[PDB]
Amino acid sequence: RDVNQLTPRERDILKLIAQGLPNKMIARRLDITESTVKVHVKHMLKKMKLKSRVEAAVWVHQERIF
C-alpha cells in the first residue's frame, strides 16, 4: 500500500522518469542495460498496482504525498 518501503532515491529517479525521460537516456545515465531499466520500470508498474504512469503521477502530485 505504501510506496515509502521502496527507496526514496528510486522514487526521485521515477519522478524524473515521469518527467518525460526516455528509457535510452535512463540506461545511459544509470549505467545499466536497457533490459534492466525495463525490468525496473516493470517492477514499479506492478508494485504500485497501476496500469499506466499518468494516473499514478497525477495522484501523487494532487495530494503531494511525497
Add this chain to the structure above:
DNA sequence: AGTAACCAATAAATGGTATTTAAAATGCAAATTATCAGGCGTACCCTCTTTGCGAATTCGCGGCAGCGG
C-alpha cells in the same frame, strides 16, 4: 470554424528465459554448566517362625491308584 485512416513511428505494453547480489535468517553441532543414579559401610547383643487360617459344608463323575485273594 474542421474533415481522414493514410504509413512510419514511437518506445511502452507485457510475461517470460537467467549469473548475480550478500545480507539476513535459519538451521545446524559443539562447551558447559546442573543433578541424577550407584556403591560402600555401620562392631552390646539378638538364632526354625513366620504362616495359610478357607481360589472354603457343591456335587456328580471318572479313574488311577493301594490292599487282597
